[PDB]
Design a protein around this ligand. Structure first.
Ligand SMILES: [Ca+2]
Ligand SMILES: [Ca+2]
Ligand SMILES: [Ca+2]
Ligand SMILES: [Ca+2]
Ligand SMILES: [Mn+2]
Ligand SMILES: [Mn+2]
Ligand SMILES: [Mn+2]
Ligand SMILES: [Mn+2]
Lengths: 234, 234, 234, 234
């Protein structure tokens, strides 16, 4: 494929363009609620993922070409307690048949299987596990729950976060930024990532999130909108 | 969904974005060959269809809104004999789980089942069946192999045909045009079509084609490229 | 330039993106009224033109490349008398400094100067002059008020006409279609046009219209919206 | 206007889409060289600006609506000496008739006139003047050479910088990021900026740059490509 694009200003309650996995659902107001909410309150031990229906052609073995892509999405992570939060939300790419992996700190993306899984993620990590830096962080993750690069992230409870992720194929640069319009505060991180080596030719793209494994480490992970475009020169 | 787009300047030999049904395949040079070719020669009794992976949201029961869409594709129909041709090629919309229907003059789109099937097609018909006008034609077909409107079509054997189809939701106008750049000859037809009444909320879009049911009524039906865009106001 | 696009769903009353020439104005409801209207009634001897502010790079002498482009616009031509009409409306390309040429049957586009002017137009001609066929027509015009190709055009008084014009650089094919959603009636014409030979490298694009030179040959020429895109491979 | 877009993968040597002011020129290889280079070496006391030909409709007094916009551009600033650099490069919006203002630290954008000029800029400042913080910085500037917000910027001599600027009208958030693909290092800054209050309804957008006012404070300021899109809801 050469060019694929799609833009949701909000999500449809029974989405056919979006493959919902685990606890993910679209609320009737059109928020993509990745992790469970009960009586308006986030629940623990939740794992939800959402992928776009069409696979994306990110590289081609015949032509040796790599896709470029850009995506925008806004998301909210709201926790009943500012200091106890887990586990986070991520935008990711994985093989098209990708299924939910471990919950909790593995973010539904990775596992501890000793079989290195193919998934490239931009995580917004709200809990410091063994493999994390100390502070909440935006991480670029290449086939590991351990980020290859991260920036410390001043998570704002319940505030809309605007994210813009792009991948420039000609330089192998993956760049992720987050901005909180509420107080015009922003964070960015970039990495040199070889998508040909990390991922298969075709992938599915989307989001994954998990709530903490305890009652006092719960938060929501809602996506409010999403735009994506990818071009493969071919 | 609000906006979905995709553009192929040619097709990938093992397409993941394109669901190939019946005899459809992508050749190694990237043509979408809907009907069978053997030793470079079209074969009879063939039926092939290709659909885009992502369903398209063409209308919404809650918001009462209808999508607009536009698509461009180029296609070749080549017959070893100018005067004996069958059966044709079509661009269509159908429920997402749509499967190949009858072969031959039914174009893989419709059947004679007495169970009116949901499919809206723009056919390029190369054989005059019982339900057709006399001459080869471009037809707009709403849940029937019988066109509600058609224009006579001067098919050019083996020449590239450029098609542009659009649907204007605000007026319910479906317009289909074909141009042969080789001699700058063009045909157009339009119809007032209520997609809400003809189709379910979500559909898949693509192409369907069949070769004749006899050895002396064979032709190819190759699509060379394809661009599509649909917006649902919501 | 490689890609230029712009889309108006209606026009701004004091447009800065649109260079208005002669009698052209934008009404407060956002219609581009090319020719004069007085007390709601079309006036004779009027000439109005509108061009997009940015020049469009349609070909390049260094790279030998030609642009492709596509444009959509809706327009109304309303005459107080169905049988007496003049003169018409056109979409055109001309050098960027292009100024209004002759009025009346020259459509503000051409003149009788014996100095062949550079302008390539798709005219919707409502009056049969000396150089016209008999019937109202959609014409493709290459540096002459005389069309190189035309299709007879069933003008519908006061009805919205939807036009789609495209130019495919790889085949030099200019295609123009018009559809009246009101009764789903359509017309199309195509021509092999060498834009490199007809036009300079850079042009401005837009509309031109004139009302008849007599009181009993008056009509309006309003454009309701306009989308344009052009890509030059370079 | 509702939607305006344009994308250059490089610039044309005699650009008609781009209004070049002061010393700005396009090199024969298609770089937009804002400030003077002599025998391949940057010259002092230079000031160059480039604007897109079409004005952009950023807000509308009648409808009370504000545009959103996004733009990407890559740029190089190369100095013969790493530690002596001046003055910088900026992306800006200003009234359409905007002309070059003061040189040097005023970046061709502002002056010391005591007549507050309308210009909103995202500067990449390479020299600490009286109104600057100490370190080189990316600044958001609203009708002043003094930034309202800035982030410290690790300028990389002679390296390609990729910038992405967006403005979200619904939150009044202007966000600017820079990434050096060479070592995947990134910077971002955001501000709450009211474009209705800072700028007139229509503007022109582009770049401005100046070299230092001394021989030992020289650098280049070349833009390599540029994409822009703006939508005004209206
Ligand atoms: Ca963690
Ligand atoms: Ca038939
Ligand atoms: Ca005439
Ligand atoms: Ca400075
Ligand atoms: Mn982490
Ligand atoms: Mn038929
Ligand atoms: Mn004529
Ligand atoms: Mn500064």
């Amino acid at each position: 494929s050469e060019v694929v694009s799609f833009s949701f200003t909000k999500f449809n309650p029974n989405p056919k363009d979006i493959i919902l996995q685990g606890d993910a659902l679209v609320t009737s107001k059109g928020k993509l609620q990745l992790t469970k909410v009960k009586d308006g309150k986030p629940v623990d031990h939740s794992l939800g993922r959402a992928l776009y229906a069409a696979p994306i052609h990110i590289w081609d073995d015949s032509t040796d070409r790599v896709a470029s892509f850009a995506t925008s999405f806004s998301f909210v992570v709201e926790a009943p307690d500012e200091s106890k939060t887990a586990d986070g939300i991520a935008f990711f790419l994985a093989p098209p048949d990708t299924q939910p992996q471990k919950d909790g700190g593995f973010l539904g993306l990775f596992n501890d299987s000793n079989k290195s899984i193919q998934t490239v993620a931009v995580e917004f990590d709200t809990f410091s596990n063994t493999w994390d830096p100390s502070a909440r962080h935006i991480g670029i993750n290449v086939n590991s729950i351990e980020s290859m690069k991260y920036v410390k992230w001043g998570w704002e409870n319940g505030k809309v976060a605007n994210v813009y992720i792009s991948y420039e194929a000609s330089t192998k640069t993956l760049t992720a930024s987050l901005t909180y319009p509420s107080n015009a505060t922003s964070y960015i991180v970039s990495a040199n990532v070889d998508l040909k080596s990390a991922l298969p030719e075709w992938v599915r793209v989307g989001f994954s999130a998990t709530s903490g494994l305890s009652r006092d480490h719960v938060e929501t992970h809602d996506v409010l909108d999403w735009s994506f475009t990818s071009t493969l020169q071919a």
